[PDB]
Write a protein that binds this ligand. Structure first.
Ligand SMILES: CN1C(=O)[C@H](c2c(-c3ccc(Cl)cc3)[nH]c3c2c(=O)[nH]c(=O)n3C)c2ccccc21
Length: 337
C-alpha cells in the first residue's frame, strides 16, 4: 500500500470510445475527446459537472492544455488546423491552417513557460510510416516560427514531451525513432532507434537523467539521456498495455483502436507509473531492476479496454484517469500513504 484509494467515480457523458483525456495544469479540470469528435470539459472536485460540450465538425486528433493561461486548450485537427479554445468563455479564439500536404495534427505540447508550443503534422495514413513535420509556434501571436528538420527523412511524430524548464523536447515517431531536441539551439541533440514499430508515448523522468518510452513492440524502455540509445532498463508490458485495443460483440463486428493518446502517466515525483489494461489502470513502481517489474496496484472498474490514462497531483492528492472503448472515464482518487 504505497497509496490509499479514497474513491472511484465514473464520468459517462461520452457515448463513443475515448481518444484523449488530460487534466489541466491547475489539476482541477479535464478535457476529454472521443472518436465522434465530442470534446467535453469538466470538473470532478467535489463532484463531476460538465463545463462545456461541443461536437467538432472537423475530425480532431490531439489536445493539449496551456501551461500559464490554464483555461486555454489547443485542439489539433485532421484537416491541418490548430484551434485555440477558451474553456472559461466557451468559444474559439482562433483557428490556424498549416499546409494541407500534412493534415494530421497528431501531437501538441505546450512549453512550461507559456510562450511556445509544438505540434506534429503528418501526411494521410496509407502504415503510419508516412512523411510528417514538427512545428514550433508562438502562443501569444499563434504564429508558426520554425520547423525542425527530421533525419533521415520526414516522418509522422506520434508523441511529444517537454522537460521541466522547457529547454528539451523529446519526441517519438512512426519509424520507431526517438528524437530529443534542444529548444534553445533549435536542433536535434540526440536520436536513436527506440522500438520495432511506432513509438506511442515518451516522457522525461523526474530527475531528467532518463526518458521513458512505450511502443508498438509492447516494450517499456528507459533510456540514458546522456548516452544515445543506451538502455537503462527494458520490460515487455502485457500486450493489453499497447493494444491494438479491440471491443468485439459476437456479431462478426469489432471496434479496433490503435494507440493515439497517452499510454502512461506518473505521480508527482515519478516514482510510480499508470498504464492501460483490459480491465482498468495498472500501476508499477519505477526504480529498481527486478527482472519482471510487478504490478503494485490495479485500479479496476472497466468492462471495456482502457486505451489512454492520465495522472495529476493537486492539493496533495492524486487523480488517475482511465478511459475505455465504451466511452467511460474512471476517476480514481489516490492519497500517498
Ligand atoms: C485572447 N487570447 C489569449 O489569451 C491568447 C494569448 C496567449 C496564449 C495563446 C495560446 C496558448 Cl496555448 C497560451 C497562451 N498568450 C497571450 C495571449 C494574449 O492574448 N495576450 C498575451 O499577451 N499573451 C501572452 C490569444 C492568442 C491569439 C488570439 C487571442 C488570444
Amino acid at each position: 500500500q504505497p497509496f490509499i484509494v479514497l474513491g472511484q467515480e465514473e464520468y459517462g457523458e461520452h457515448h463513443s470510445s475515448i481518444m484523449h483525456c488530460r487534466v489541466d495544469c491547475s489539476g482541477r479540470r479535464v478535457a476529454s475527446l472521443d472518436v465522434d469528435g465530442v470534446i467535453k470539459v469538466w470538473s470532478f472536485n467535489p463532484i463531476m459537472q460538465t463545463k462545456a460540450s461541443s461536437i467538432s465538425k472537423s475530425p480532431l486528433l490531439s489536445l493539449e492544455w496551456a501551461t500559464k493561461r490554464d483555461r486555454l486548450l489547443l485542439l489539433g485537427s485532421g484537416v491541418g488546423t490548430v484551434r485555440l479554445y477558451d474553456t472559461e468563455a466557451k468559444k474559439n479564439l482562433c483557428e490556424i491552417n498549416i499546409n494541407d500536404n500534412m493534415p494530421r495534427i497528431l501531437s501538441l505540447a505546450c512549453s512550461p513557460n507559456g510562450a511556445s508550443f509544438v505540434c506534429s503534422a503528418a501526411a494521410p495514413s496509407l502504415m503510419n510510416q508516412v512523411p510528417g513535420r514538427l512545428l514550433l509556434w508562438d502562443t501569444k501571436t499563434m504564429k508558426q516560427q520554425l520547423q525542425f528538420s527530421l533525419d533521415p527523412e520526414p516522418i509522422a511524430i506520434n508523441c511529444t514531451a517537454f522537460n521541466h524548464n522547457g529547454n528539451l523536447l523529446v519526441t517519438g515517431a512512426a519509424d520507431g525513432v526517438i528524437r530529443l531536441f534542444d529548444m534553445q539551439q533549435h536542433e536535434c541533440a540526440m536520436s536513436w532507434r527506440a522500438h520495432y514499430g511506432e513509438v506511442y508515448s515518451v516522457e522525461f523522468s523526474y530527475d531528467e537523467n532518463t526518458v521513458y518510452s512505450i511502443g508498438e513492440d509492447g516494450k517499456f524502455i528507459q533510456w540514458n539521456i546522456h548516452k544515445s540509445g543506451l538502455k537503462v532498463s527494458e520490460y515487455s508490458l502485457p500486450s493489453d498495455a499497447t493494444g491494438p485495443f479491440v471491443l468485439s460483440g459476437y456479431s462478426g463486428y469489432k471496434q479496433v483502436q490503435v494507440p493515439r493518446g497517452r499510454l502512461f502517466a506518473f505521480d508527482s515525483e515519478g516514482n510510480y507509473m499508470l498504464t492501460c489494461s483490459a480491465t482498468g489502470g495498472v500501476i508499477y513502481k519505477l526504480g529498481g531492476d527486478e527482472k519482471v517489474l510487478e504490478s503494485c496496484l490495479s485500479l479496476g472498474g472497466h468492462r471495456a479496454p482502457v486505451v489512454t490514462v492520465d495522472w495529476s497531483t493537486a492539493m496533495d492528492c492524486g487523480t488517475c484517469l482511465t478511459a475505455s472503448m465504451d466511452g467511460k472515464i474512471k476517476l480514481t482518487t489516490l492519497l500517498a500513504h
